[PDB]
Amino acid sequence: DEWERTERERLQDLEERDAFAERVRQRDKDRTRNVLAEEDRKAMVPELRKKSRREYLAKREREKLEDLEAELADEEFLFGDVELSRHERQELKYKRRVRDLAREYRAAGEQEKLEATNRYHMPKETRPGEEQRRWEEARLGAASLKFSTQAQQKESIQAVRRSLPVFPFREELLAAIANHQVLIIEGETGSGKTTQIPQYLFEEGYTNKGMKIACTQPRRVAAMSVAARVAREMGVKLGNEVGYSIRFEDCTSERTVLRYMTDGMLLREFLSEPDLASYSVVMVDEAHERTLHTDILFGLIKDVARFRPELKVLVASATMDTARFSTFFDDAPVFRIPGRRFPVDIFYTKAPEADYLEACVVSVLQIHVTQPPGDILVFLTGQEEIEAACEMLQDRCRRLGSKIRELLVLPIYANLPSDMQARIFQPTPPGARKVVVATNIAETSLTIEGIIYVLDPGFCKQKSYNPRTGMESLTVTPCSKASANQRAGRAGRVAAGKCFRLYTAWAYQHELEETTVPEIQRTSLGNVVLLLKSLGIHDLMHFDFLDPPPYETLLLALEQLYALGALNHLGELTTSGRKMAELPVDPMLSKMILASEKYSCSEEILTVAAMLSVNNSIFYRPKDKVVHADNARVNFFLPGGDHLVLLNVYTQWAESGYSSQWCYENFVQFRSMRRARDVREQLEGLLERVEVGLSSCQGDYIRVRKAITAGYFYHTARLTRSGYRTVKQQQTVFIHPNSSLFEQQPRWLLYHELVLTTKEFMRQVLEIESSWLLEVAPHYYKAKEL
Amino acid sequence: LKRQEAIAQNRRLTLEDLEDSWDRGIPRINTLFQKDRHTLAYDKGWRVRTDFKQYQVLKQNPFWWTHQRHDGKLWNLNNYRTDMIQALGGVEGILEHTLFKGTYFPTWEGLF
Amino acid sequence: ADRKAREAVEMRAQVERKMAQKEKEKHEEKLREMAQKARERRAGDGEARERDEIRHDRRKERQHDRNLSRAAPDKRSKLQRNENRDISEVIALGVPNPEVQYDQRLFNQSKGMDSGFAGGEDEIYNVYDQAWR
Amino acid sequence: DDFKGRSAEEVEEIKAEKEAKTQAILLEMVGDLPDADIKPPENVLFVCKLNPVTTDEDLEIIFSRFGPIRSCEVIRDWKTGESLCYAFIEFEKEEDCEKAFFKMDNVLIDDRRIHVDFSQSVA
Amino acid sequence: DTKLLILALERLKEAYSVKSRLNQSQREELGLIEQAYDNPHEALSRIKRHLLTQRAFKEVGIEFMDLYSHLVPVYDVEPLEKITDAYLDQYLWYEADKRRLFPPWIKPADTE
Amino acid sequence: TAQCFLRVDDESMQRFHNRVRQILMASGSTTFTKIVNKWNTALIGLMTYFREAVV
Amino acid sequence: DHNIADYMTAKNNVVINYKDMNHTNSYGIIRGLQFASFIVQYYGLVMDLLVLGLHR
RNA sequence: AUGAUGUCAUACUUAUCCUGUCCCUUUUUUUUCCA
Numbered sequence A: 001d002e003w004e005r006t007e008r009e010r011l012q013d014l015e016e017r018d019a020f021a022e023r024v025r026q027r028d029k030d031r032t033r034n035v036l037a038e039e040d041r042k043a044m045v046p047e048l049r050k051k052s053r054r055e056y057l058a059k060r061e062r063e064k065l066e067d068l069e070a071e072l073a074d075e076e077f078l079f080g081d082v083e084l085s086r087h088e089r090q091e092l093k094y095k096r097r098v099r100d101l102a103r104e105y106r107a108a109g110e111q112e113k114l115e116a117t118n119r120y121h122m123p124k125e126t127r128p129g130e131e132q133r134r135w136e137e138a139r140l141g142a143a144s145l146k147f148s149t150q151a152q153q154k155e156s157i158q159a160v161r162r163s164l165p166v167f168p169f170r171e172e173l174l175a176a177i178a179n180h181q182v183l184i185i186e187g188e189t190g191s192g193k194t195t196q197i198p199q200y201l202f203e204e205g206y207t208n209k210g211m212k213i214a215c216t217q218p219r220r221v222a223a224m225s226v227a228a229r230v231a232r233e234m235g236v237k238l239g240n241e242v243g244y245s246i247r248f249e250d251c252t253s254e255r256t257v258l259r260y261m262t263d264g265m266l267l268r269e270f271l272s273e274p275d276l277a278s279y280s281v282v283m284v285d286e287a288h289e290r291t292l293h294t295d296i297l298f299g300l301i302k303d304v305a306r307f308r309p310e311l312k313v314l315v316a317s318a319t320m321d322t323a324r325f326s327t328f329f330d331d332a333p334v335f336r337i338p339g340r341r342f343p344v345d346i347f348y349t350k351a352p353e354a355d356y357l358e359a360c361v362v363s364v365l366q367i368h369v370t371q372p373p374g375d376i377l378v379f380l381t382g383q384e385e386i387e388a389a390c391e392m393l394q395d396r397c398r399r400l401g402s403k404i405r406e407l408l409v410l411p412i413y414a415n416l417p418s419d420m421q422a423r424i425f426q427p428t429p430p431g432a433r434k435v436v437v438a439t440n441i442a443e444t445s446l447t448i449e450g451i452i453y454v455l456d457p458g459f460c461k462q463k464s465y466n467p468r469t470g471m472e473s474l475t476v477t478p479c480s481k482a483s484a485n486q487r488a489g490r491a492g493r494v495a496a497g498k499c500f501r502l503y504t505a506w507a508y509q510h511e512l513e514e515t516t517v518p519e520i521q522r523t524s525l526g527n528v529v530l531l532l533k534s535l536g537i538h539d540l541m542h543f544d545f546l547d548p549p550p551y552e553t554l555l556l557a558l559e560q561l562y563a564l565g566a567l568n569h570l571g572e573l574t575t576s577g578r579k580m581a582e583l584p585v586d587p588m589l590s591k592m593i594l595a596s597e598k599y600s601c602s603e604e605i606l607t608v609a610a611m612l613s614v615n616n617s618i619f620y621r622p623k624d625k626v627v628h629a630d631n632a633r634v635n636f637f638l639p640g641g642d643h644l645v646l647l648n649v650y651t652q653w654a655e656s657g658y659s660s661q662w663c664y665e666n667f668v669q670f671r672s673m674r675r676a677r678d679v680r681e682q683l684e685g686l687l688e689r690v691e692v693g694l695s696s697c698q699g700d701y702i703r704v705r706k707a708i709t710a711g712y713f714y715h716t717a718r719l720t721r722s723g724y725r726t727v728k729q730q731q732t733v734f735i736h737p738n739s740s741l742f743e744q745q746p747r748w749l750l751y752h753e754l755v756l757t758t759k760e761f762m763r764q765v766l767e768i769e770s771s772w773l774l775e776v777a778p779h780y781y782k783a784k785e786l
Numbered sequence B: 001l002k003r004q005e006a007i008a009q010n011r012r013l014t015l016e017d018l019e020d021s022w023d024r025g026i027p028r029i030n031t032l033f034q035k036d037r038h039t040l041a042y043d044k045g046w047r048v049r050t051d052f053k054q055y056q057v058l059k060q061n062p063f064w065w066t067h068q069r070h071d072g073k074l075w076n077l078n079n080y081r082t083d084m085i086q087a088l089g090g091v092e093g094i095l096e097h098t099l100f101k102g103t104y105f106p107t108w109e110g111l112f
Numbered sequence C: 001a002d003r004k005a006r007e008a009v010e011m012r013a014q015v016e017r018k019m020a021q022k023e024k025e026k027h028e029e030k031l032r033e034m035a036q037k038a039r040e041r042r043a044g045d046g047e048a049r050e051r052d053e054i055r056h057d058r059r060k061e062r063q064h065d066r067n068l069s070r071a072a073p074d075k076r077s078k079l080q081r082n083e084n085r086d087i088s089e090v091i092a093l094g095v096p097n098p099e100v101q102y103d104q105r106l107f108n109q110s111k112g113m114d115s116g117f118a119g120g121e122d123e124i125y126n127v128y129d130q131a132w133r
Numbered sequence D: 001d002d003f004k005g006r007s008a009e010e011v012e013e014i015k016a017e018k019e020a021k022t023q024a025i026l027l028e029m030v031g032d033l034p035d036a037d038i039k040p041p042e043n044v045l046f047v048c049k050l051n052p053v054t055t056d057e058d059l060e061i062i063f064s065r066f067g068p069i070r071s072c073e074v075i076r077d078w079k080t081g082e083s084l085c086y087a088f089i090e091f092e093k094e095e096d097c098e099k100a101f102f103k104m105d106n107v108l109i110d111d112r113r114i115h116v117d118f119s120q121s122v123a
Numbered sequence E: 001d002t003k004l005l006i007l008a009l010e011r012l013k014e015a016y017s018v019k020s021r022l023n024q025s026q027r028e029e030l031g032l033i034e035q036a037y038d039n040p041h042e043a044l045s046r047i048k049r050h051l052l053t054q055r056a057f058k059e060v061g062i063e064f065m066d067l068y069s070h071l072v073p074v075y076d077v078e079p080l081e082k083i084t085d086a087y088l089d090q091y092l093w094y095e096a097d098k099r100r101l102f103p104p105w106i107k108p109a110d111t112e
Numbered sequence F: 001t002a003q004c005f006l007r008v009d010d011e012s013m014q015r016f017h018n019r020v021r022q023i024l025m026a027s028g029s030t031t032f033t034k035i036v037n038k039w040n041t042a043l044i045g046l047m048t049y050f051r052e053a054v055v
Numbered sequence G: 001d002h003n004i005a006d007y008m009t010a011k012n013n014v015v016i017n018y019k020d021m022n023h024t025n026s027y028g029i030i031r032g033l034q035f036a037s038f039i040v041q042y043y044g045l046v047m048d049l050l051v052l053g054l055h056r
Numbered sequence H: 001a002u003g004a005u006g007u008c009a010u011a012c013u014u015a016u017c018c019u020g021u022c023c024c025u026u027u028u029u030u031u032u033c034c035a
Helices: A002-031 A038-075 A086-116 A137-144 A148-161 A170-179 A196-204 A220-233 A263-269 A292-307 A321-329 A356-370 A383-405 A418-425 A481-489 A507-510 A524-536 A553-566 A575-582 A587-601 A602-612 A626-633 A641-655 A662-667 A670-687 A701-712 A771-776 B001-006 B046-055 B078-089 B091-095 C003-042 C047-071 C086-094 D009-030 D056-062 D094-104 E001-018 E024-038 E042-053 E077-100 F008-026 F032-050 G002-011 G034-054
Strands: A180-184 A214-215 A242-246 A247-253 A258-262 A280-285 A314-319 A334-336 A344-348 A373-380 A407-412 A433-438 A451-456 A462-466 A471-476 A497-501 A718-719 A723-726 A748-751 D044-048 D071-072 D088-091 D115-116 E059-067 E073-076 G015-018 G019-023
Touching: A002 A292, A038 C047, A038 D009, A038 D094, A038 D115, A086 C003, A086 C047, A086 D009, A148 A220, A148 A383, A148 A418, A170 A180, A170 A334, A180 A321, A196 A220, A214 A220, A214 A263, A214 A433, A220 A242, A220 A247, A220 A258, A220 C086, A258 A263, A263 A292, A280 A292, A292 A314, A292 A524, A292 A701, A314 A321, A356 A373, A356 A383, A356 A418, A356 A433, A356 A451, A418 C086, A451 A481, A481 A497, A497 E059, A507 G019, A524 A553, A524 A575, A524 A587, A553 A587, A575 A587, A587 A602, A602 A641, A602 A701, A626 E001, A626 E042, A641 A662, A641 A670, A641 A701, A662 A670, A701 A748, A701 A771, A771 E077, B046 E073, B046 G034, B078 B091, B078 E077, C003 D009, D044 D094, D056 D071, D071 F008, D071 F032, D088 D094, D094 D115, E001 E024, E001 E042, E001 E077, E024 E077, E042 E077, E042 G002, E077 G034, F008 F032
Parallel strands: A180 A314, A180 A334, A214 A258, A214 A280, A242 A258, A280 A314, A344 A497, A373 A433, A373 A451, A407 A433, A451 A497, E059 G015
Antiparallel strands: A242 A247, A462 A471, A718 A723, A718 A748, D044 D088, D044 D115, D071 D088, E059 E073, G015 G019
């Protein structure tokens, strides 16, 4: 098939790849010049002992570090249980006390240091969250007036195991798929379809012949959860035979039979081994999730399904998506699991409503006041709405005093500080109610036990990308039937629930569209379009889609890539073009990274990329500390723009030694910072392959802004006296309020986002020269237009 | 003590532990919980500083010795008003002395 | 006098420093004793198999650690410690329980940062603090 | 004083003397070596970056070039035997150790640019 | 520093609590307080510049407060320097009390 | 073991008296309710400081 | 810090002005500065030391 | 004898304005000799 043309290309891909890397190391052995009595010798032998000694000091203390850690790492899982004897027992006493002695005989020296810099030193003329416990002993000091059972665990595991909606459905489903290679398996959450199924497969030996069993998930954290769960079931260590591989974190060994991953992870395994010949089975979970990676894997694995009939295709999901599922997949049989723990009474408003956020408020008010025990889940659209919500709720709490009971309002969304995410996971303080205000982040993968009420105002904030304008707008959107059903289904998992729809049966049954548009239509796909072009294709049109994009969307993609220089004038791959597809993240960024090669601003452009990878959550902007926050922000504000702002911010953080309290003092989201650092480090781990020399701009931000241009020339606007307006389409934009240039308002502007919130917007913007534009893109940007 | 036990039994100190002693104490226990504890843990030397304001402002403070945000609020004379009315006679005895009945307002609860 | 006092401060400082230094080293010699007798006191039906497990686990651990540091300079420092600080991670990992907090009907019942005594003003009506009825 | 007021050089040199003394006493603390820091024989090179396919025989071959060998010891992962991709190699002369070193540093054998440094072993 | 400067400026507005007919000079001082309340970093830049380079200041005016039994001097400083000193006041007292400069017998203390 | 007998100091009585004196003196330009607001402020400031030395 | 010590000490030495008389402070302290609380209590610490002695 | 150049404040014009403005949902990309 086109599959075979692909793997043709891809095996030749691996051949040419290995040979290329080998050629390059030969090149470097060429470039690199191997230029390699009595008292001279007896001189430097003391100096070779100098270095032997000192490198040995670090080396010996390093080996001490190794076995040091190893003693306790070893006594973690052997001693505290078993009936063990004299030898290793005595040596546990030994290694216990002995690593104590090491820590102690070093803590002595550090004690000397700090005690002897405690002291008084005449000045010399030369030209963690406890500001509310350091103000709670101010008061108590101002107010002082003095003058076997592991087998038992296994029993419990199996005993719960047996009660799944799949444990009695065990055998016949096994025999069924033994018949059919492609078996669609419809079942809702809690059935265990993600957990019990791969076990069944393994105990049935599909791992024999050394084979593996893949489980893909759309979310890292969900994969980690799943893997922990099934490794506990299987009674082994997570990582050796049951393992998960996600970006930045391998948790597998060559004992791994049961390997969990992401959809992009599996696509990238096709960047390793087109056949998956070590995998006997791929089980794709929750495919309904509608990601670009799901919709690529569908095609690729369907190819493999026709090409590899000894291979096994399992695709499980939550909802009615089996119609199109089977139909695209040659109408595979559909095994139905019935799985739904407890019931929901789903209510509708009497009528349609005008003020649905307030309606949220007054609803939970009534519910809390009247209802029996039980936790509440409420949806909003997102951040600003949601804090306004807790505003209103806690204000009415203030007014209603002891007339009511303790209402643990907790907001939760994606960018809010991670301690504040975790805070909802604590068991509720007896007698009080806990209400979680949430976004559709709480649709999926977050498991909050205790929630017995669920309120849906029936909406969502969906992105919508029109390509005719290049505009993606995160705007309000009445949420689908599948949405409302699943938002409701979030409930019940331990008891009878309720689901209050802020809209009637009429609007529900009548004007409810089934599914969110399968992602590939609505999204922008520059990295992804390019990825499929460089992954076994030329004709990008008759390709085996599930849902193709509009030819419009594809045409825009092609023009994007050509103009940027990834495409020839006929649409195939340049050296610049390939290098970017292999490079992780999109091209515009990729073009900028290549531009660092020309501009000798390698490190700085690297760190910038690392920032734009995650930005959306950098700076925490609380209402209760607005001014000090704006301040720890306004500190770094550099001349040139937000990108070099980010550059210095990261620079200063790592400067502090990757300090968390640093960002805590300086109002920065530690999550964003450290994941960005990781993406830059693995970028550097790509950097050798993409042939980048590690260079500094030596403080010359001109190179920086110019590499930014050489990447993002497309993303530019100019001054018009009727506002800031595009360079090309002359459609009218506005600057984000929180821009480091927001009041600077430059004449020649570069951005990184293009949205239209309440008005058209652009994010991560910088001031440029129109001259660099004739430096870089005289074929795309001509002078007369500037 | 209750704070220790709230750490040991790890409970949350609830309103029932502190509604009894809610304006008692010297700072005042209801200063523990005010809005701006966070930026008032940074105001040190406030007592000397209000003493010395007398050389900077041309007016004379009668509460130089204290601070309402920091020391609490240390007197409550809300019943003075109530007993003043009952001793003068009650609102009816009190408004037989005034022009109230010549306004033809129907009752005195609304007066503003 | 300022020069003289600077000198005497520094001389007294380094005297006392050196005294406590020597005392620290004596402490350390006692701990040298502790270590020697520690291994001495150490040296002299599950343990044999748990012990093949000892060297099995530890030695494949050295395998993975060497090989980490060899594929990437410290891929041990890029894998194992970096495994264990982020929060969603830990919650999925079932690690348990990884200060006083109390009810929120307590907080923010008063807002303001200035004493109500208006800074020495008198002529304003602030006697009682509740509107009459 | 005067263990500080001599230079900056010998100052930090004394502190490196220390760092040694402390790391030694530390490593004996956690208990590896029987006798404290006895000077290592000048006649063994520790040669790392090695190949699991180069053996005692071949390494003793190539390091037979510069001096009379007393042994070639690639320490073995015990219950599987796989070469540890490093080694100790044992000469008769200081001159033999040195002459092997100063030509064999960072050379490519079996397509790997191995490293030679002298033995740090007190083992 | 923004906590220390917020405390400074609150202390300074307490003078003009009533917002009387004040004058030109008090109108101008209130303007300075508000603009440094809006842009708290132009302020702190200005402050630390003053503290670093200035050693010749404007002149201060004097007058007396008559307490009928003796008089009290009252000094009038210029609003720019009033702000730099308010900040330095807060800062020195915070640091001095954290480092424990003043032993416990120095007694207008904040504890009682 | 002992008793403390308290009294208001002489100079504190005199300072209260001078404070009332300047109320009355600067009141030909105040309205009845401001004269009484200043009286109320001064008298609370005395009674709540001394509190049983006044008795 | 010698910078802050110098700012404080040079700020006490200003020209003091009443209706039409002017003079220059050179000896004592202007108590109407805002750090003058700090200066008075530090000086008073030094004089506590002269009264009690360092041992007591 | 009137040049443009201007970071010049002042003066001046249009019965020219005082009513035409504001904060993102979800989440994913494989990696390489250590020394």
